[PDB]
Each structure stands twice: as structure tokens, then as C-alpha cells.
């Protein structure tokens, strides 16, 4: 199978520099153009540039928005595509994708996240959301987890390691001050909690932090 795997994304300060990689396999790398495309959170796709194939001497083009500032290159022995990004600004924060191109059997990487900011890597505070102690029941009960004050994105949340997925809603993170907050809710039958355990599993790879918060009554 054709695979494209991006890496090298992360948090960097304004004015900083970063090098993205896209390791490829399952096709003859040198036959294809390769493009970089980016998407700021909740925004449109923006094409950044490409590097051509061997028949076209691996020449490059760039959109006006990054021309002179970003450099695409490729290592043809190991079949890896690079994007060198210089003098970064907040507007460059986005998910960056590599895509096979040529000049279509179509193939994009999963994307790598770049965040340009003065805020620092911070693990989340994870708070259990259980009904108030003077709350009265019924057949279903809704619990939640509040994931507050972390940076950068992303965080992932599961409930009982995935087994409760059908009644789960995890809400997109929002920036406040300059930290992220999200929440996630889960609905289960009133008969199953608190008789059985409900735990929200929160992972924040950027800070190397995973937290399991059991939701207890009160």
C-alpha cells in the first residue's frame, strides 16, 4: 500500500524555524511530484508548494504566501519529503499535509500539527463532572470530564478505554487566555453508575501526560 507519514510538527516560538518530514513507501518516489498543503484549525486548505519528479529535475514552486520563506526538498534514496519553514508567525499555525501529486490515484498523509505561539507546553487539569449531591435521578445519567488549561493541542479523551463510545460527546477545544479547554460527556443507564466504574481517560502527548479520572458521586 501507498503510505505517507508526516512528522516533525510541534510547538515553536514566533520567529522560529521548523523542519517537517514526510516518509513515503509503497510507490516509486522519484516518479511523482509531492505537494505540501496546510489547514489552520477550522479554516480552508491552502496549497503551499511542490517539488517535481525526476523527469523534471526535482524543481520547486511555492505559493506567494511562503515563497522565499519555506523550502521544499527531497531525499530520493530514502524516499522522504521535507518542508523547511523559517521565520514563523502565528498565522502559520496549522495542520500541514503532504500529498502525492504528478502531472490521479490519490494519497495524503495524516497531517502533522504546527503551533506558533509564546505560550508554553502545559499539561491539562482534568476535573470530574458528577451530578450535584442534591440531584435527583431518572433512567439515564450524564457524566463528564472537564479538561482545562492545556497547551498545545491536541488532547484525546476516551471513556472506560473506549467501551462507552456510543453515549459519548467530546467537544472541540477552545482557546481562552492562551490555554485550551475542552469537555467531554458520557451518558449511561442510571443502573450502571455508580454501581460500576466510569473513568475518563485523557491523553496529552505534548506533555507526555495521561490521566485516568474516575467519576465518583457527590
Amino acid at each position: 500500500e501507498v503510505k505517507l507519514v508526516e512528522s516533525g510538527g510541534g510547538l515553536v516560538q514566533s520567529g522560529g524555524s521548523l523542519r517537517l518530514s514526510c516518509a513515503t513507501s509503497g510507490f516509486t518516489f522519484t516518479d511523482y511530484y509531492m505537494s505540501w498543503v496546510r489547514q489552520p484549525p477550522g479554516k480552508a486548505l491552502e496549497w503551499l508548494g511542490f517539488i517535481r519528479n525526476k523527469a523534471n529535475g526535482y524543481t520547486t514552486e511555492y505559493s506567494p504566501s511562503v515563497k522565499g520563506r519555506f523550502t521544499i526538498s527531497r531525499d530520493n534514496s530514502q524516499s522522504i519529503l521535507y518542508l523547511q519553514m523559517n521565520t514563523l508567525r502565528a498565522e502559520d499555525s496549522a495542520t500541514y499535509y503532504c500529498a502525492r501529486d504528478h502531472d490521479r490515484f490519490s494519497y495524503w498523509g495524516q497531517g502533522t500539527l504546527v503551533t506558533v505561539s509564546a505560550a508554553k507546553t502545559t499539561p491539562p487539569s482534568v476535573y470530574p463532572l458528577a451530578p450535584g449531591s442534591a440531584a435527583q435521578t431518572n433512567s439515564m445519567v450524564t457524566l463528564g470530564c472537564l479538561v482545562k488549561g492545556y497547551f498545545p493541542e491536541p488532547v484525546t479523551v476516551t471513556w472506560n478505554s473506549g467501551s462507552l463510545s456510543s453515549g459519548v460527546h467530546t467537544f472541540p477545544a477552545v482557546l481562552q487566555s492562551d490555554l485550551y479547554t475542552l469537555s467531554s460527556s458520557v451518558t449511561v443507564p442510571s443502573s450502571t453508575w455508580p454501581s460500576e466504574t466510569v473513568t475518563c481517560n485523557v491523553a496529552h502527548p505534548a506533555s507526555s501526560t495521561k490521566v485516568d479520572k474516575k467519576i465518583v458521586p457527590r
Binding site: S125, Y127, P128, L129, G132, K148
Partner: peptide, 12 residues
């Protein structure tokens, strides 16, 4: 909507 409210956790 099904609406539910939650007070601050003791942890917070």
C-alpha cells in the same frame, strides 16, 4: 436538547 448542569469539582 437534553440539558444537564454540573457544579465545580472539589478538585478544581
Amino acid at each position: 436538547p437534553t440539558v444537564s448542569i454540573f457544579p465545580p469539582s472539589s478538585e478544581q
